[PDB]
Design a protein around this nucleic acid. Structure first.
Lengths: 306, 283
DNA sequence: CCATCACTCACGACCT
DNA sequence: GAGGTCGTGAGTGAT
């Protein structure tokens, strides 16, 4: 006969989460079109990020030099979405600009789930977790490839980011924060038009800053003549696969290239075959040392299952 | 029959509700172990109590006044400062002389912080990318997006896509950067096309000193014709891995014996010898 | 125009 | 007596 009291507790919960909803400092607009479980997950994300931020002071980001409207301008001028989360899977913050790169609004996405493993396709989960399994290389970068469930495939997105220090806290103990910029990869890039000799027809002009080599200087030069002698075998087997078949065959590659002034600049290349004889187009993206290490781990893992 | 599917689809419903309940309880328990006024008492107070203290934390944080919110200009800018792999450099809009500089330049390209301050920006910037730069922060506006090269560190160029708004004059802008052995490379004749930097410890040589020359010179007279003949075989051996042993010379003038194994890598389509890769081991 | 589907929402009964 | 949970109908839509 708990009809009376259980009702009171249920409605008490509903009232406090109504307070949460209207106090949730999101827009007056999308919130009326919400669900309760949705409101709960959203409020948890806000409280988490809030206690994280308030536990520190505004030290090295002096304020006043920028305006909040101009801040929205800045984030409107980014080629992707920002994401900050915990390695336990717990989300912290997502800029709404994700819409212009994912369609589904941020509020429509963090609704059904409150984790990275809720906005990511199953396939890459373990792989993601793998690159997240290592909680080391502090204040050093990490780079991984993964998909985000699209607004129904799910577009592959590159993620590059850095870990930071967890402030004194029993929860954040064993849980540092990870901030990262993410961007849809399939369209800071140099595009390569390659033929069946892995030669060089046309390159994006931007290679002039990536390699110090003007476009004309590369016209009709074997790109193999720029490969590190070690990842050579990887690139070779990938050319084998891109040649032995006939169709829209895709390829991935982690490589190192030299420079005019000397030195080394690792690159991550992707390829898709236009025609069985048509030119092979490719998109390249420059990375850092560890920003190739993590990719090598994910790549070899993707090859272990085979 | 169909009534057996009734309570079996009702079973699916019961399990959906089960997941709903445990999920709400999970959001609740995480909120508990998160907010400090509930992250301590191991006898976690009843769900209503933690809801109340959560209402407390949320509103006390949201006391600002006079997307509206959900991130501060301070907060977003702080994160992009420590995330974008970039740096902050306030400059002038009347002359250009550096106003403020961040220590976030310090580890990204290992550049000193306050060396820009004390100098102007055109000092260590390609004058060729100064031309319109000067005429971009100018007065008579628009959202800034001018591509600009930037110097690297010099103690122990890169393009930054600086977007923003000019200010009082001065210019404030930010953005993510718009970006024991040795193995070598030979031609079909034997000229160094590439050589790793480990030569300083295997032959006592910087790599450029061997790049542009043929190995056969640095081979001992008693071993020269051997090594030549050997590579002649290894070429037509279709990349089958192969080794040679010759007395590599040295600027130390010490005759050191060593072994080198080499084979050919052929672009599988062209089948033409594109380069020769030689592994070398100093003993 | 319903027809199976998930998803959200209340409610009396039910552990401890 | 408090706190919480496993369960269902009635109404509600997107597919």
């Amino acid at each position: 006969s708990t009809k009376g009291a259980s009702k009171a507790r249920r409605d008490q919960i509903n009232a406090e989460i109504r307070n949460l909803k209207e106090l949730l400092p999101l827009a007056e607009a999308d919130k009326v079109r919400l669900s309760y479980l949705h409101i709960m997950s959203l409020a948890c994300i806000y409280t988490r990020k809030g206690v994280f931020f308030a536990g520190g002071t505004p030290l090295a980001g002096p304020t006043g030099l920028l305006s909040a409207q101009e801040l929205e301008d800045i984030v409107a001028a980014l080629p992707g979405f920002l994401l900050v989360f915990t390695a336990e899977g717990k989300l912290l913050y997502l800029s709404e600009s994700v819409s212009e790169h994912l369609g589904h609004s941020m509020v429509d996405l963090v609704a059904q789930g409150d984790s990275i493993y809720d906005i990511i396709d199953p396939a890459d989960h373990l792989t993601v977790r793998q690159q997240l399994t290592m909680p080391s290389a502090l204040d050093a970068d990490r780079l991984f490839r993964c998909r985000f469930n699209t607004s129904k495939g799910n577009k592959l997105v590159l993620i590059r980011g850095r870990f930071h220090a967890h402030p004194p806290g029993a929860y954040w103990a064993g849980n540092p924060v990870f901030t990262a910029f993410c961007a849809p990869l399939e369209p800071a890039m140099f595009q390569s038009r390659h033929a069946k000799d892995l030669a060089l027809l046309d390159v994006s002009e931007s290679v002039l800053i990536y390699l110090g080599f003007e476009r004309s200087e590369l016209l009709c030069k074997s790109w193999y003549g720029l490969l590190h002698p070690e990842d050579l075998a990887q690139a070779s087997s990938q050319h084998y696969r891109l040649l032995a078949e006939s169709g829209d065959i895709q390829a991935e590659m982690v490589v190192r290239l030299q420079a005019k002034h000397g030195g080394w600049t690792w690159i991550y290349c992707m390829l898709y075959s236009e025609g069985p004889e048509g030119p092979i187009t490719a998109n390249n993206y420059p990375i850092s040392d560890t920003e190739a290490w993590s990719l090598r781990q994910q790549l070899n893992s993707e090859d272990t299952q085979a | 029959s169909s009534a057996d599917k009734e309570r079996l689809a009702r079973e699916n419903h019961s399990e959906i509700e089960r997941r709903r309940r445990n999920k709400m309880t999970a959001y609740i328990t995480e909120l508990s172990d998160m907010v400090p006024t509930c992250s301590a008492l191991a006898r976690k107070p009843d769900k209503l109590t933690i809801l109340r203290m959560a209402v407390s934390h949320m509103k006390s944080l949201r006391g600002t006044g006079n997307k509206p919110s959900f991130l501060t200009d301070q907060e977003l800018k702080h994160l992009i400062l420590e995330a974008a792999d970039g740096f902050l450099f306030i400059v002038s809009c009347e002359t250009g002389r550096v106003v403020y500089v961040s220590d976030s330049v310090t580890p990204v390209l290992n550049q000193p912080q306050s060396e820009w301050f004390g100098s102007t920006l055109y000092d260590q910037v390609h004058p060729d990318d100064v031309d319109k730069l000067r005429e971009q922060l100018s007065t008579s506006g628009s959202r800034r997006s001018f591509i600009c090269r930037m110097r690297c560190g010099t103690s122990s160029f890169v393009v930054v896509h600086c977007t923003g708004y000019i200010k009082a004059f001065c210019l404030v802008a930010i953005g993510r950067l718009q970006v024991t052995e040795f193995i070598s490379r030979h031609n079909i004749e034997g000229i160094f096309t590439f050589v790793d930097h480990r030569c300083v410890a295997t032959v006592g040589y910087q790599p450029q000193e061997l790049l542009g020359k043929n190995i056969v010179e640095f081979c001992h007279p008693e071993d020269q014709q051997l090594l030549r003949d050997s590579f002649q075989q290894v070429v037509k051996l279709k990349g089958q891995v192969l080794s040679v042993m010759f007395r590599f010379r040295s600027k130390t003038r010490e005759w050191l014996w060593m072994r080198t194994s080499s084979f050919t890598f052929q672009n599988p389509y062209s089948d033409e010898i594109e380069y020769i890769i030689c592994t070398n081991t100093n003993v």
